[PDB]
């Protein structure tokens, strides 16, 4: 079943609509991802069910502007369901995307300013 999720990201939509979201390493271990996804670099792109959870990350804690991307996928792993009460940041409502997200699955990009204000206009991906 396909679901909509969201991701904060500072990269340009020109880059993201072209290349999609790629992962930084090959580890498929979800427990290790939750503990430290840099050690080893994990084969998941993090996304959330809740668009508001992207804002503090996209803005680097209110320091800069950034984008909230929307995507539609059917291969994500619900982290809270898989890890249970052990989920370390359960409030994030994380859907971890194994192997990343193809550009064709990205719906659009919506800017957010440092103060947390989402812009009125969402830039849609022509690949849809």
């Amino acid at each position: 079943d396909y679901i909509i999720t969201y991701r904060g990201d500072t990269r340009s939509f020109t880059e993201i609509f072209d290349k999609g979201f790629e992962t930084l390493g090959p580890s498929k271990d979800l427990y290790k991802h939750a503990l430290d996804n840099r050690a080893p670099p994990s084969d998941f792109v993090s996304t959330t069910i809740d668009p508001t959870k992207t804002i503090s990350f996209a803005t680097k804690y209110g320091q800069k502007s950034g984008y909230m991307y929307t995507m539609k996928t059917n291969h994500g792993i619900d982290v809270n369901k898989a890890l249970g009460a052990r989920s370390p940041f359960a409030a994030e409502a994380e859907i971890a995307m194994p192997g990343g997200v193809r550009a064709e699955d990205i719906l659009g990009a919506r800017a957010v300013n440092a103060d947390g204000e989402m812009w009125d206009y969402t830039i849609l991906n022509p690949k849809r």
């Binding site: 993090s46 940041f89 359960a90 409030a91």
Partner: protein, 132 residues
């Protein structure tokens, strides 16, 4: 993109001001430089700034960094590392998952529980993860 942030450090016991440069380049390349007295003391190249900062602090063992990212109980979540290039992390507490109100910017000021090595921070984080 280049961003700069003044920070406070304790260098061999003396309070000092230093300046961080964050240079984000294509292909997920994060470069963190630290300048003090207009001289570059160290640089780290990685894929997120929390990892860069841990490497920087290991290169500069004689310096206490008065920053949230140096605090024993601070660590990024997978999501915060990924979505913010490691700039947003969480203050963690025994037996408790991290909440939005626990989020911090890794270069914001902190002077409590920062006189610790990056390895001690990783150890606290591992014990915290097991405490859940």
């Amino acid at each position: 993109d280049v961003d700069k942030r003044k920070i406070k450090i304790i260098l061999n016991g003396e309070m000092e001001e230093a300046e961080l440069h964050m240079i984000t380049s294509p292909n997920r390349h994060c470069c963190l430089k630290i300048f003090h007295n207009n001289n570059q003391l160290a640089e780290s190249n990685d894929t997120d700034y929390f990892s860069c900062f841990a490497d920087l602090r290991n290169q500069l063992k004689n310096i206490i960094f008065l920053c949230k990212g140096a605090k024993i109980n601070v660590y990024p979540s997978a999501m915060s590392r990924d979505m913010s290039d490691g700039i947003v992390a969480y203050e963690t507490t025994l037996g408790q998952p991290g909440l939005p109100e626990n989020q911090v910017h890794i270069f914001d000021f902190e002077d409590k529980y920062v006189d610790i090595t990056p390895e001690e921070q990783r150890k606290f984080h591992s014990q915290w993860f097991e405490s859940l």
